[PDB]
Design a protein around this ligand. Structure first.
Ligand SMILES: N#Cc1cnn2c(Nc3ccc4c(c3)CC(=O)N4)cc(Cl)nc12
Ligand SMILES: N#Cc1cnn2c(Nc3ccc4c(c3)CC(=O)N4)cc(Cl)nc12
Ligand SMILES: [Cl-]
Ligand SMILES: [Cl-]
Lengths: 4, 123, 123, 4
């Protein structure tokens, strides 16, 4: 999971 | 403020290809001369300007069989259909001309681009 | 010996979400209490262990309407359906419990994982 | 396009  | 799962789109596409391999919820047969290819209309539209046009048509949207132009090569179509469902393109010296012609007909601009670049490098 | 187009899976998913927004080729309505959500069975199966089980069932595969357990929160479902079609999860303090419970029911393990990690960080 |  990432900060887009 | 959303978070994003990097592999989600690839995981979705992998499962769509599994559905295709098992012939689950396929809703169209694409006929290319003597050959038939089962697929999901939604995936075809998502990948191809030609299928996007065909399946948004108020009559063609309901057809279970689509016949492609007799000049279309079945192997070239097979390679492009595999690409649609996997992001992988089996581009070879022996098939590049057929793949590029099929990609132009199917309106798959990124495939056409790369075919053009690979041909330019060999001349 | 294939080449691969990096953005292909994301581009496919973007077009599948465009089809959903325009209600094109949607083949199921998911009923969550008083709310209804139209979707494509193939995308639901590709994202959820629950829908994969439902739509591989020889009888449920043909249903146009699926009613979820009355304990399922419509907003939580909405957030997860948006995630299915975009890879983006709108995870907030006010919705995390509903999102995690919905993800457990839908069998969306990666979403459950992250909800568990975000909850553990706040305790 | 890349070599996967
Ligand atoms: N709704 C919808 C929807 C479903 N599919 N789809 C598009 N599919 C498409 C159209 C043109 C081209 C390609 C894909 C690859 C290419 O080279 N050209 C576009 C849009 Cl703008 N919208 C949609
Ligand atoms: N054919 C087919 C096919 C269509 N969909 N699909 C799967 N969908 C799925 C099943 C379980 C889970 C998820 C997705 C996300 C998650 O957390 N669990 C799996 C397989 Cl092995 N195959 C398929
Ligand atoms: Cl393309
Ligand atoms: Cl997930």
């Amino acid at each position: 999971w990432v900060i887009p | 403020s959303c978070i994003q799962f990097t592999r989600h789109a690839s995981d979705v596409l992998l499962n769509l290809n599994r559905l295709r391999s098992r012939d689950i919820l396929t809703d169209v047969v694409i006929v290319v001369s003597r050959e038939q290819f089962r697929a999901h209309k939604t995936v075809l539209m998502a990948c191809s300007g030609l299928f996007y046009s065909i399946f948004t048509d108020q009559l063609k949207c309901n057809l279970s069989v689509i016949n492609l132009d007799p000049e279309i090569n079945p192997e070239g179509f097979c390679i492009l259909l595999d690409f649609m469902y996997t992001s992988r393109l089996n581009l070879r010296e022996g098939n590049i001309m057929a793949v590029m012609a099929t990609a132009m007909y199917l309106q798959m601009e990124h495939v056409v681009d790369t075919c053009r670049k690979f041909i330019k490098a060999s001349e």
